[PDB]
Ligand binder design. Structure first.
Ligand SMILES: C[C@H](NC(=O)[C@H](CCc1ccccc1)NC(=O)c1cc(Cl)c(Cl)[nH]1)c1cn2cccnc2n1
Ligand SMILES: C[C@H](NC(=O)[C@H](CCc1ccccc1)NC(=O)c1cc(Cl)c(Cl)[nH]1)c1cn2cccnc2n1
Lengths: 96, 96
């Protein structure tokens, strides 16, 4: 039972963080936006003043739920359904 | 113009982080989602082992660009414009 609306479509913190992360290309041709950049923490611990991984702290991913569009029917260029996905944005350092 | 079906299909880090943050509502009745929870860093510095703020490190917000729908024309229940907006998700600790 669809609820159809019309839609018109028209910093190196990752390296300097004490919980640094890498950026993964999440690419899905069935989704708009097709490309989402997601974070993966580099280490389990956090970097200390000497540049070493200190495992008494935890690098953890900062996540959120966001809105994307999913092609429906599949491969449709002009019709979609709303979709909620969980994504990792960056990482932070937490006390255990 | 595309067709969208509105029928959607599918960790207290903010407190324990060395760059802790606060969460506040970003609300807009003209937008889907109408409510977006955004982060503000609690301090300029980062919390050290003893629990004090160390200004030799900076708390910085981790931001990303996300998809929202804005009613077009205003107040329309079934007509939208795709928008890209910058949001603050959480905070991390970076070295100068
Ligand atoms: C800032 C920019 N963002 C992006 O292009 C996308 C933009 C998504 C978008 C497209 C069209 C309309 C509305 C929104 N947003 C995301 O990728 C995203 C959001 C969250 Cl939330 C997480 Cl997680 N990822 C970017 C480029 N980048 C290149 C390399 C590494 N990172 C990079 N980010
Ligand atoms: C995890 C949850 N998220 C959320 O309900 C929303 C969900 C957004 C959404 C709605 C409908 C369809 C698809 C997506 N997403 C966001 O709020 C959001 C995304 C980014 Cl990116 C930043 Cl920034 N904010 C939540 C509740 N919360 C209550 C208090 C404090 N934090 C909270 N988070």
């Amino acid at each position: 039972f669809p609820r159809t609306v019309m839609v018109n479509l028209n910093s190196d913190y990752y390296n300097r963080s004490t919980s640094p992360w890498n950026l993964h290309r999440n690419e899905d041709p069935e989704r708009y936006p097709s490309v989402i950049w997601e974070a993966k923490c580099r280490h389990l611990g956090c970097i200390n003043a000497d540049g070493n991984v200190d495992y008494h702290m935890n690098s953890v991913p900062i996540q959120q739920e966001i809105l994307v569009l999913r092609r429906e029917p599949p491969h449709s260029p002009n019709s979609f359904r709303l979709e909620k996905i969980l994504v990792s944005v960056g990482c932070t350092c937490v006390t255990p």
